[PDB]
Amino acid sequence: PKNVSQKDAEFERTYVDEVNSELVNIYTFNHTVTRNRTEGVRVSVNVLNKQKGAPLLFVVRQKEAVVSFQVPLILRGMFQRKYLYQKVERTLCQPPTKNESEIQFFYVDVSTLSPVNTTYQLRVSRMDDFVLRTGEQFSFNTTAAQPQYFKYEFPEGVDSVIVKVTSNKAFPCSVISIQDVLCPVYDLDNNVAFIGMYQTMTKKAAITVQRKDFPSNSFYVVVVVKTEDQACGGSLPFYPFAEDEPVDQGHRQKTLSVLVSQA
Amino acid sequence: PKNVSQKDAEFERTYVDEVNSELVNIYTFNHTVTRNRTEGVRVSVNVLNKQKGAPLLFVVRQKEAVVSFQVPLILRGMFQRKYLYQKVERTLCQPPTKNESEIQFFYVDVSTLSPVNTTYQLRVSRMDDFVLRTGEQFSFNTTAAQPQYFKYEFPEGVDSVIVKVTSNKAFPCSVISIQDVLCPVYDLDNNVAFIGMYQTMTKKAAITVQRKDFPSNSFYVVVVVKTEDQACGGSLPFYPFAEDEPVDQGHRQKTLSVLVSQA
Ligand SMILES: *[C@@H]1O[C@H](CO)[C@@H](O[C@@H]2O[C@H](CO)[C@@H](O)[C@H](O)[C@H]2NC(C)=O)[C@H](O)[C@H]1NC(C)=O
Ligand SMILES: *[C@@H]1O[C@H](CO)[C@@H](O[C@@H]2O[C@H](CO)[C@@H](O)[C@H](O)[C@H]2NC(C)=O)[C@H](O)[C@H]1NC(C)=O
Ligand SMILES: *[C@@H]1O[C@H](CO)[C@@H](O[C@@H]2O[C@H](CO)[C@@H](O)[C@H](O)[C@H]2NC(C)=O)[C@H](O)[C@H]1NC(C)=O
Ligand SMILES: *[C@@H]1O[C@H](CO)[C@@H](O[C@@H]2O[C@H](CO)[C@@H](O)[C@H](O)[C@H]2NC(C)=O)[C@H](O)[C@H]1NC(C)=O
Ligand SMILES: *[C@@H]1O[C@H](CO)[C@@H](O)[C@H](O)[C@H]1NC(C)=O
Ligand SMILES: *[C@@H]1O[C@H](CO)[C@@H](O)[C@H](O)[C@H]1NC(C)=O
Ligand SMILES: *[C@@H]1O[C@H](CO)[C@@H](O)[C@H](O)[C@H]1NC(C)=O
Ligand SMILES: *[C@@H]1O[C@H](CO)[C@@H](O)[C@H](O)[C@H]1NC(C)=O
Ligand SMILES: *[C@@H]1O[C@H](CO)[C@@H](O)[C@H](O)[C@H]1NC(C)=O
Ligand SMILES: *[C@@H]1O[C@H](CO)[C@@H](O)[C@H](O)[C@H]1NC(C)=O
Ligand SMILES: *[C@@H]1O[C@H](CO)[C@@H](O)[C@H](O)[C@H]1NC(C)=O
Ligand SMILES: *[C@@H]1O[C@H](CO)[C@@H](O)[C@H](O)[C@H]1NC(C)=O
């Protein structure tokens, strides 16, 4: 039958491994959390082989929710366009814990059904600046297939805050959303407009957050980068009308500086 | 390590199996398709044990896309409400094939991390009436966690069609969308308003579809059932304000009759 291999891998290490229609890989990750100090976990993977038919299939499994994606991931534009991305990065949703110190386990499983080998490099990073401190600026890089989000913990005596996010290069377009702390977090392109307050931005954005709307005394600031700059007001490129041929967008990235300040 | 079991199960059979934090089950399904005759596949599963902490995790894997969900699935309402559902049913997205006759494989994997056993019944049904014939009425049942969709093949000489969907009982509310034929199909509640033309309905809806907007000469009619009837105009129930306690909605269902007619 199918050959499944397992490993108890660790954080902060890039594993380069092969896979095919026969091999399925499993990685187990242990993680330590405390109620007072909460910190996020980022799963980032890249593929160094160009395949168009059968992509790699990745699943990240937790105690509560399951996330999954295929890579090279294909996004959508306007007129039936296809953009191909090789590196995908996503931050997991961790529910608030009950006990003071509970060790949390999560799994990453890799598979595919293409008949030929394919190499991927996978790593998990314990994100140090998951929390946003008041009056401090944080600069970070986001692409269309690397959504990010940070947790703001409302402090005592603060009735409302204002989240200000700025960029120097106007393009690409992006969407900045404020959401409650409850799994799951809609950081994908298609579901970023379901709940929360969201603004489309190209260079600057500012959203006012109030505590009465968030009974859990915290929220998530989610940043997503779009593929086509039509919404932000740009001119769409005149790429050939390839209905079933995906074209790469090259190196499209956005550097964003975020600061949460008391109102 | 983790114990993984595998089985080459068949269509039209309900398998009742146990699982825990140690067991992971794999089912392989073979499926036969032809270019002229395309027909959908439905994966339907139920859980007969009541668990609130650690749910069952299900993944359905294809050659192209991967879908995943946790059950009993928790949906969202308006004021931080939680609705729990035990049975989940979903139809897979099958891309149009190239060769005249190609056998397609797809896998269903089941796991969980709860320390106690849990029993699930899983079945796969080859949906006979995946296609919609012109001038014919089809009646079907949908719930909030059982989205459906049917493929309409535009015939020769038809410039445009009109899709008319009706119901007798006004509630629950539902969303009816028309989308192009391209994996994936957004049949979930959070992404049903990304692409395509969609109408919210309670008793009747009608959408006009044109061929010039669909170069592939086919489309998908997707039906989704909401949880709260506020959008359709109903009065929300005065359930207790349970922020972290999910309440079941009972037996909420909608019977819908759909007909696609030439304009
Ligand atoms: C989390 O899991 C990792 C993976 O096994 C543990 O890392 C091992 O720790 C032992 C104990 O010192 C070492 O002997 C091994 O060499 C480590 N493995 C590797 C690959 O370096 C880690 O200890 C676990 N965390 C905790 C808190 O126990
Ligand atoms: C965001 O991306 C930019 C561009 O890739 C990074 O700027 C580069 O940083 C490296 C490492 O310091 C330098 O070697 C390059 O010369 C820089 N290039 C440019 C054009 O500035 C930037 O460091 C990234 N930001 C973060 C936080 O990683
Ligand atoms: C698809 O897979 C099923 C699962 O094995 C196959 O069903 C078996 O078919 C053989 C051949 O007649 C029988 O001897 C077994 O008893 C069947 N098992 C079950 C569980 O049904 C099926 O044949 C496969 N399809 C094709 C076209 O080969
Ligand atoms: C949709 O659901 C209704 C209600 O469950 C089904 O109606 C039942 O059908 C069964 C089987 O024929 C009967 O034994 C029940 O008496 C019916 N109950 C009612 C209230 O009508 C209906 O058959 C379902 N539709 C489909 C296509 O499965
Ligand atoms: C199955 O695959 C695993 C993973 O590479 C390997 O360690 C094992 O030897 C394989 N078993 C057989 C019988 O080939
Ligand atoms: C966490 O913080 C609270 C108050 O901020 C404190 O009472 C508690 O002791 C802290 N937890 C630990 C493990 O120190
Ligand atoms: C906290 O830990 C104790 C023992 O370590 C356990 O009995 C209890 O169930 C834990 N709390 C939760 C909410 O799981
Ligand atoms: C994948 O690579 C290994 C080692 O390079 C090789 O033994 C194996 O045959 C390759 N897979 C296939 C399907 O050829
Ligand atoms: C591992 O689990 C499988 C699935 O139930 C079982 O068949 C097998 O005997 C188990 N192996 C051991 C060593 O317990
Ligand atoms: C499929 O239909 C086309 C025209 O409708 C026909 O030419 C072709 O022979 C059909 N395929 C098979 C396998 O009969
Ligand atoms: C169709 O089948 C033949 C052999 O049966 C194979 O060589 C060919 O690659 C198949 N077509 C596609 C598009 O894969
Ligand atoms: C699950 O059920 C089987 C048979 O009923 C039993 O042997 C096993 O111990 C159960 N699992 C646990 C964790 O007790």
Residue numbers in the entry:
A (entry chain A), B (entry chain B): 25 to 287
What does the paper say about this structure?
Human SIDT1 and SIDT2 are closely related members of the SID-1 transmembrane family, and have been implicated in various biological processes such as glucose and lipid metabolism, innate immunity, and tumorigenesis. Here, we present the cryo-electron microscopy (cryo-EM) structures of human SIDT1 and SIDT2. Both structures reveal an overall architecture of a dimeric arrangement composed of an extracellular domain (ECD) rich in β-strands and a transmembrane domain (TMD) with 11 passes, highlighting the remarkable structural congruence. Importantly, the ECDs of SIDT1 and SIDT2 bind synthetic plant-derived miRNA only under acidic conditions.
SIDT2 also contains ten predicted N-glycosylation sites, with all six glycosylation sites on its ECD well resolved in the EM map, along with the corresponding disulfide bonds. A conserved hydrogen bond between S105 residues is observed in SIDT1, corresponding to S92 in SIDT2. In addition, Q113 in SIDT1 may maintain a hydrogen bond interaction with N219 from the other protomer instead of the ionic bond interaction observed between R100 and D204 in SIDT2. Furthermore, SIDT2 features an additional β-strand (residues 27–33) involved in interactions at the dimer interface, while the corresponding region in SIDT1 remains unstructured, indicating a high level of flexibility and fewer interactions at the dimer interface of SIDT1 compared to SIDT2. In the SIDT2 ECD model, the dimerization interaction involves a buried surface area of ~1700 Å2 from each protomer, in contrast to ~1300 Å2 in the SIDT1 model, indicating differences in the proximity of the formed homodimers between SIDT1 and SIDT2, probably due to sequence variations. Sedimentation velocity analytical ultracentrifugation (SV-AUC) analysis further confirmed that SIDT1ECD exists as a monomer, with a sedimentation coefficient of 2.8 S and a molecular weight of ~44.6 kDa, while SIDT2ECD forms a dimer with a sedimentation coefficient of 4.8 S and a molecular weight of ~74.2 kDa. The distinct ECD oligomerization states might be attributed to variations in amino acid composition and interactions at the dimer interface as shown in their structures. Furthermore, analysis of surface electrostatic potential on the ECD structures revealed positively charged regions on the β-strand surfaces of SIDT1 and SIDT2 ECDs at pH 7.5, with increased charge density and expanded distribution at pH 5.5. At pH 3.5, nearly all ECD regions displayed a positive charge, supporting the observed low-pH-dependent RNA-binding abilities of SIDT1 and SIDT2.
